[PDB]
Design an enzyme around this catalytic site. Structure first.
Site, PDB file in Angstrom:
ATOM      1  N   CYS A  84       0.920  -1.016  -0.147  1.00  0.00           N
ATOM      2  CA  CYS A  84       0.049   0.233   0.105  1.00  0.00           C
ATOM      3  C   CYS A  84       0.754   1.324   0.158  1.00  0.00           C
ATOM      4  CB  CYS A  84      -0.987  -0.057   1.262  1.00  0.00           C
ATOM      5  SG  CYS A  84      -2.016   1.477   1.310  1.00  0.00           S
TER       6      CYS A  84
ATOM      7  N   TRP B 264      -9.200   6.431   0.144  1.00  0.00           N
ATOM      8  CA  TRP B 264      -9.538   7.156  -1.105  1.00  0.00           C
ATOM      9  C   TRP B 264      -8.543   6.815  -2.323  1.00  0.00           C
ATOM     10  CZ3 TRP B 264      -8.118   9.852   3.500  1.00  0.00           C
ATOM     11  CH2 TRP B 264      -6.974  10.334   3.373  1.00  0.00           C
TER      12      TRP B 264
ATOM     13  N   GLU C 103      -5.259   4.151 -10.226  1.00  0.00           N
ATOM     14  CA  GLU C 103      -6.022   2.915 -10.296  1.00  0.00           C
ATOM     15  C   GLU C 103      -7.246   3.031 -11.131  1.00  0.00           C
ATOM     16  OE1 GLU C 103      -6.314   1.670  -5.793  1.00  0.00           O
ATOM     17  OE2 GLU C 103      -6.037   3.831  -5.500  1.00  0.00           O
TER      18      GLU C 103
ATOM     19  N   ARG D  59       0.111   4.411   3.008  1.00  0.00           N
ATOM     20  CA  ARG D  59       0.243   4.356   4.504  1.00  0.00           C
ATOM     21  C   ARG D  59       0.531   5.674   5.338  1.00  0.00           C
ATOM     22  NH1 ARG D  59       4.399  -0.539   4.438  1.00  0.00           N
ATOM     23  NH2 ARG D  59       4.549  -0.152   2.101  1.00  0.00           N
TER      24      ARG D  59
HETATM   25  C1  HEM Z   1      -6.216   6.500   2.586  1.00  0.00           C
HETATM   26  C2  HEM Z   1      -5.838   6.490   1.092  1.00  0.00           C
HETATM   27  C3  HEM Z   1      -5.340   5.353   0.516  1.00  0.00           C
HETATM   28  C4  HEM Z   1      -4.622   4.957  -0.590  1.00  0.00           C
HETATM   29  C5  HEM Z   1      -4.371   6.086  -1.465  1.00  0.00           C
HETATM   30  C6  HEM Z   1      -4.271   3.743  -1.100  1.00  0.00           C
HETATM   31  C7  HEM Z   1      -3.449   3.340  -2.131  1.00  0.00           C
HETATM   32  C8  HEM Z   1      -3.285   2.116  -2.264  1.00  0.00           C
HETATM   33  C9  HEM Z   1      -2.874   1.596  -3.649  1.00  0.00           C
HETATM   34  C10 HEM Z   1      -2.715   2.465  -5.007  1.00  0.00           C
HETATM   35  C11 HEM Z   1      -2.917   0.154  -3.761  1.00  0.00           C
HETATM   36  C12 HEM Z   1      -2.523  -0.655  -4.766  1.00  0.00           C
HETATM   37  C13 HEM Z   1      -4.075  -0.965  -5.374  1.00  0.00           C
HETATM   38  C14 HEM Z   1      -4.011  -1.932  -6.711  1.00  0.00           C
HETATM   39  O1  HEM Z   1      -3.265  -1.506  -7.553  1.00  0.00           O
HETATM   40  O2  HEM Z   1      -4.672  -2.799  -6.520  1.00  0.00           O
HETATM   41  C15 HEM Z   1      -3.236  -0.135  -2.321  1.00  0.00           C
HETATM   42  C16 HEM Z   1      -3.308  -1.447  -1.760  1.00  0.00           C
HETATM   43  C17 HEM Z   1      -3.460  -1.694  -0.521  1.00  0.00           C
HETATM   44  N1  HEM Z   1      -3.835  -0.918   0.388  1.00  0.00           N
HETATM   45 FE1  HEM Z   1      -3.802   0.994   0.436  1.00  0.00          FE
HETATM   46  N2  HEM Z   1      -4.622   2.933   0.025  1.00  0.00           N
HETATM   47  C18 HEM Z   1      -5.468   3.833   1.015  1.00  0.00           C
HETATM   48  C19 HEM Z   1      -5.867   3.197   2.160  1.00  0.00           C
HETATM   49  C20 HEM Z   1      -5.846   1.896   2.644  1.00  0.00           C
HETATM   50  C21 HEM Z   1      -6.564   1.754   3.969  1.00  0.00           C
HETATM   51  C22 HEM Z   1      -7.506   2.445   4.754  1.00  0.00           C
HETATM   52  C23 HEM Z   1      -5.979   0.141   4.041  1.00  0.00           C
HETATM   53  C24 HEM Z   1      -6.315  -0.553   5.387  1.00  0.00           C
HETATM   54  C25 HEM Z   1      -6.807  -0.258   6.427  1.00  0.00           C
HETATM   55  C26 HEM Z   1      -5.200   0.055   3.108  1.00  0.00           C
HETATM   56  C27 HEM Z   1      -4.673  -1.449   2.630  1.00  0.00           C
HETATM   57  C28 HEM Z   1      -4.119  -1.756   1.663  1.00  0.00           C
HETATM   58  C29 HEM Z   1      -3.855  -3.114   1.321  1.00  0.00           C
HETATM   59  C30 HEM Z   1      -3.976  -4.356   2.252  1.00  0.00           C
HETATM   60  C31 HEM Z   1      -3.461  -3.054  -0.139  1.00  0.00           C
HETATM   61  C32 HEM Z   1      -3.081  -4.374  -0.916  1.00  0.00           C
HETATM   62  C33 HEM Z   1      -4.167  -4.831  -1.576  1.00  0.00           C
HETATM   63  C34 HEM Z   1      -4.144  -6.076  -2.359  1.00  0.00           C
HETATM   64  O3  HEM Z   1      -3.013  -6.922  -2.146  1.00  0.00           O
HETATM   65  O4  HEM Z   1      -4.937  -6.348  -3.217  1.00  0.00           O
HETATM   66  N3  HEM Z   1      -5.049   0.910   2.090  1.00  0.00           N
HETATM   67  N4  HEM Z   1      -3.266   0.875  -1.656  1.00  0.00           N
HETATM   68  C1  LIG Z   2      -8.521   1.146   0.614  1.00  0.00           C
HETATM   69  C2  LIG Z   2      -8.037   1.205  -0.865  1.00  0.00           C
HETATM   70  C3  LIG Z   2      -7.421   2.664  -1.299  1.00  0.00           C
HETATM   71  C4  LIG Z   2      -7.265   2.702  -2.607  1.00  0.00           C
HETATM   72  N1  LIG Z   2      -6.761   3.990  -3.053  1.00  0.00           N
HETATM   73  N2  LIG Z   2      -6.895   1.554  -3.423  1.00  0.00           N
HETATM   74  C5  LIG Z   2      -7.309   0.278  -2.582  1.00  0.00           C
HETATM   75  C6  LIG Z   2      -7.100  -0.973  -3.685  1.00  0.00           C
HETATM   76  C7  LIG Z   2      -8.543  -1.208  -4.347  1.00  0.00           C
HETATM   77  C8  LIG Z   2      -8.450  -1.944  -5.613  1.00  0.00           C
HETATM   78  C9  LIG Z   2      -8.775  -3.228  -5.784  1.00  0.00           C
HETATM   79  C10 LIG Z   2      -8.767  -3.858  -7.018  1.00  0.00           C
HETATM   80  C11 LIG Z   2      -9.198  -5.324  -7.274  1.00  0.00           C
HETATM   81  C12 LIG Z   2     -10.049  -5.370  -8.377  1.00  0.00           C
HETATM   82  C13 LIG Z   2      -9.764  -6.604  -9.271  1.00  0.00           C
HETATM   83  N3  LIG Z   2     -10.002  -7.842  -8.880  1.00  0.00           N
HETATM   84  C14 LIG Z   2     -11.015  -8.395  -8.122  1.00  0.00           C
HETATM   85  C15 LIG Z   2      -9.930  -8.974 -10.089  1.00  0.00           C
HETATM   86  C16 LIG Z   2      -8.105  -3.153  -8.066  1.00  0.00           C
HETATM   87  C17 LIG Z   2      -7.968  -1.872  -8.274  1.00  0.00           C
HETATM   88  C18 LIG Z   2      -7.186  -1.214  -9.288  1.00  0.00           C
HETATM   89  F1  LIG Z   2      -7.739  -1.642 -10.397  1.00  0.00           F
HETATM   90  F2  LIG Z   2      -6.026  -1.147  -9.316  1.00  0.00           F
HETATM   91  F3  LIG Z   2      -7.752  -0.103  -9.347  1.00  0.00           F
HETATM   92  C19 LIG Z   2      -8.032  -1.077  -6.780  1.00  0.00           C
HETATM   93  C20 LIG Z   2      -7.809   0.308  -1.685  1.00  0.00           C
END
Ligand code: HEM
Ligand SMILES: Cc1cc(N)nc(CCc2cc(CCCN(C)C)cc(C(F)(F)F)c2)c1
Ligand code: HEM
Ligand SMILES: Cc1cc(N)nc(CCc2cc(CCCN(C)C)cc(C(F)(F)F)c2)c1
Ligand SMILES: C[C@H](O)[C@H](O)[C@H]1CNc2nc(N)[nH]c(=O)c2N1
Ligand SMILES: C[C@H](O)[C@H](O)[C@H]1CNc2nc(N)[nH]c(=O)c2N1
Ligand SMILES: [Zn+2]
Lengths: 413, 409
Positions: free
Chosen positions: A111, A283, A288, A114
């Site tokens: 993430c 957010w 994304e 963070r």
């Molecule tokens: C507050 C603004 C936040 C932003 C801008 C943000 C941004 C991101 C982004 C860009 C990713 C990669 C998403 C992807 O390409 O699928 C990500 C992944 C992740 N975020 Fe954050 N996030 C936020 C909040 C949170 C919160 C609130 C949590 C948990 C309490 C969290 C936990 C995670 C986890 C566990 C992943 C890995 C998801 C996966 O492996 O599919 N994030 N986040």
């Molecule tokens: C809490 C949070 C904030 C933030 N900015 N981004 C995330 C990641 C959420 C996310 C999930 C997923 C999983 C969907 C597709 N599979 C189910 C096949 C994709 C994306 C994406 F595509 F990068 F935007 C973003 C989570």
């Protein structure tokens, strides 16, 4: 393992020293002979498995509040030990639950957001017993986190796993997503990523509008029971119509997206306890939506349609028409969200904030696990500071983990 | 175990068996991944098993494993290590080893070409003048009037570590970088240090933005010597844009030939500390890294200005816009001048095809996703969605220290 690992930033020459990796608890999948860093994904705890996991966590919590070795620390340890001994599990105190969730986020190596980890509203839904209750908790979460566009990060935590046959699960992968419909001709209407889940919903009784941007119903499983369908009240679903500051034709593509990214299919692990239902939301980072959701071949795949409208030469790949269209699409997304006052962060600001975060964590915590493959944005990588930043990836606990999709495991009543 | 790699876009799954053949470490452990660390972490007795392993796979590759030629070669190498503390590769082996070092280079997206490599044996070289001659011949052959051809020139192997051959330049062709009194940098900041060493050794610097550096050549452990590469051998491209007629007024150029000269080629225990190798550019190498890195030519602002872009907020993506236009210019310039170059879309497509070939005929393909994915437009290329396994196979190219941190004069 060596006590001090160093990471370098090749643009600033800044060197950081990681000692936190020594607290690593789970495995990465790599070995000394192979690295699996680009691999996406590389019956309960018994009493004896649970004791040292709980103690490790309780020690960590009490260490964080600067009461390590205190009477309250020894007492809590003793009470947890008693509970595991007489019930094969234990219950976290509210303070511990909050600390655990925040740290699961703090520890999430994938993430980039963070820097915000300690501002997380934690909703304790451990008293929930039914799907209707889960729905009430989820509505309240969506409304709180949405905050009329001023998004606030939040998590709602449903009861932990007991014997494995009474799991709470949100079947949706996100609380808010668009439906995908496979057509007889092989084309897809809506979001191709959600075809499988959409089909499950239709089979469960959902009447689909069959549009391009149909918000899916929640499919909610409480206490191991068969899942139930609920429609999110549409006034609770904030959406943003996508337009472009220069191209007036952009709005004619009829694109929009939802304001709230909320992952609902991960497992939260705290002190050996497993919360199989813990939807969390933050957010969006623009890329994304603008790069992945819109421009992935297996998603909305709009690059060509945008390129045609841009009158780009699309015969040679070396015209970089794809890259050119990609930027305009991402410009549009950022502009549409900012104009409608819905929180969003661009990839430059998000990555620069992440470097600042990482440096603070190396200072105060002795490290910051980060997955470079995921941290670097999907466009313009090397003109963001994270590209040049070496990162150590490792798994600390508490943590958010992947779990199998519930329809693959659910025992239908 | 057999390992599967999935492509998340095509859903194509490949099975890796080749990784089982590796013996060299990656740096990662079961608990810590060092996938984004740029540089993680002989004797007769160490030498023979390495020689054996190499001879064995050479003879396994010409389908003569356990043949008379194979048996005799193992015997021949045995005797020679014992008597002489080292051994010499046959020509056939040298060529096989160099091609295979390329094939095994996990960080190279260009490997679909691996078996088309012109190998120049320079193991009879004894002096820096000898080296200069070999290098000029390489540059002329590989440049080929713009129709670039992959090549490697291999100088004598390491003996005692006191008599190393080294090309001190990091690439054969590179531009000088100058520290200014006003604290800024003229030319290329990556080469500021190397430039000072040339100046200190007697190079008279023109002090321009794109002055080709001299070669600094060290033969048999002796002090390095300066040589000017004859200019008619140095192919350069003036960068212009197909629509922005003001782009040529930025005074940008680059050289056509990318020729890494600071790496170490390892083959069957033998170490070749001087093996400059060259191919042709992927556009982003110049247009993104060389021009737009903060620590390089850093031209984004200047370009963004000429495009009259709003530069107040980062959220206007003005940097991204300028970046795409620069890379369009680089591709267009090289193409218009009939100088070989590949765009990152074409190169990554070829790499996926290459990966498929390798899995089919070889049982795997080691690849470093951190290096393979281009520095722009990552997820609109097929490699972004391609799981890759990284592991170390031998023969290989390895990093070695800068010569000036080890050399006594
Ligand atoms: C507050 C603004 C936040 C932003 C801008 C943000 C941004 C991101 C982004 C860009 C990713 C990669 C998403 C992807 O390409 O699928 C990500 C992944 C992740 N975020 Fe954050 N996030 C936020 C909040 C949170 C919160 C609130 C949590 C948990 C309490 C969290 C936990 C995670 C986890 C566990 C992943 C890995 C998801 C996966 O492996 O599919 N994030 N986040
Ligand atoms: C809490 C949070 C904030 C933030 N900015 N981004 C995330 C990641 C959420 C996310 C999930 C997923 C999983 C969907 C597709 N599979 C189910 C096949 C994709 C994306 C994406 F595509 F990068 F935007 C973003 C989570
Ligand atoms: C012929 C066309 C070629 C193309 C398009 C190509 C492309 C690339 C690119 C883009 C990189 C990453 C460069 C960087 O970011 O610094 C790279 C690295 C590399 N290439 Fe290739 N290359 C080609 C030829 C070759 C040849 C001929 C060899 C050797 C015989 C080779 C061996 C390597 C090695 C060892 C690296 C890693 C460099 C390092 O670790 O610093 N490549 N290549
Ligand atoms: C043989 C070959 C072909 C090809 N297309 N590319 C290469 C890599 C050349 C290369 C070297 C280097 C090293 C110079 C910078 N440091 C001194 C800071 C950089 C790059 C680039 F441009 F950054 F990608 C590319 C090698
Ligand atoms: C194969 C590769 O691991 C996979 O495509 C990864 C690459 N990096 C990513 N990075 C982010 N943020 N999100 C992703 O889904 C992916 N996908
Ligand atoms: C920290 C990180 O490993 C470093 O910036 C890497 C990232 N990926 C790269 N990829 C390529 N092709 N070339 C590079 O120099 C780098 N640098
Ligand atoms: Zn690893």
């Amino acid at each position: 393992c060596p006590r001090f690992l160093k990471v370098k930033n090749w643009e600033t020459e800044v060197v950081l020293t990681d000692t936190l990796h020594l607290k690593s608890t789970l495995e990465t999948g790599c070995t000394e002979y192979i690295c699996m860093g680009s691999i996406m994904h590389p019956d309960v705890a018994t009493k004896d498995q649970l004791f040292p996991l709980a103690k490790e966590f309780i020690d960590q919590y009490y260490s964080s509040i600067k009461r390590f070795g205190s009477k309250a620390h020894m007492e809590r340890l003793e009470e947890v030990n008693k509970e595991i001994d007489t019930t094969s599990t234990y219950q976290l105190k509210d303070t511990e639950l909050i600390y655990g969730a925040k740290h699961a986020w703090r520890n999430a190596s994938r993430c980039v957001g963070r820097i915000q980890w300690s501002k997380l509203q934690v909703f304790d839904a451990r008293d929930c017993t039914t799907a209707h209750g889960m729905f009430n908790y989820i509505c309240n979460h969506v409304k709180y986190a949405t905050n009329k566009g001023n998004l606030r990060s939040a998590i709602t935590i449903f009861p932990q796993r007991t014997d494995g046959k009474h799991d709470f699960r949100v079947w949706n992968s996100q609380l808010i997503r668009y439906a995908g419909y496979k057509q007889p001709d092989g084309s897809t209407l809506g979001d191709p990523a959600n075809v499988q889940f959409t089909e499950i919903c239709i089979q469960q009784g959902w009447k689909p509008p069959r549009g391009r941007f149909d918000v899916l119903p929640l499919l909610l499983q409480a206490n191991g029971n068969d899942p139930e369908l609920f429609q999110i009240p549409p006034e609770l679903v904030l959406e943003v119509p996508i337009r472009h500051p220069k191209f007036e034709w952009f709005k004619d593509l009829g694109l929009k997206w939802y304001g709230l990214p909320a992952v609902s299919n991960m497992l939260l692990e705290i002190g050996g306890l497993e919360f199989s239902a813990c939807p969390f939301s933050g957010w969006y980072m623009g890329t994304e939506i603008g790069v992945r959701d819109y421009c992935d071949n297996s998603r909305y795949n709009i690059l060509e349609e945008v390129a045609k409208k841009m009158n780009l030469d699309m015969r040679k790949t070396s015209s970089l028409w794809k890259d050119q269209a990609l930027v305009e699409i991402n410009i549009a997304v950022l502009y549409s969200f900012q104009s409608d006052k819905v929180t969003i962060v661009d990839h430059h600001s998000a990555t620069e904030s992440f470097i600042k975060h990482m440096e603070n964590e190396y200072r105060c915590r002795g490290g910051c696990p980060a997955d470079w493959v995921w941290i670097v944005p999907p466009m313009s990588g090397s003109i963001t500071p994270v590209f040049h930043q070496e990162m150590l990836n490792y798994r600390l606990t508490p943590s958010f983990e992947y779990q199998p999709d519930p329809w693959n495991t659910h025992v239908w009543k």
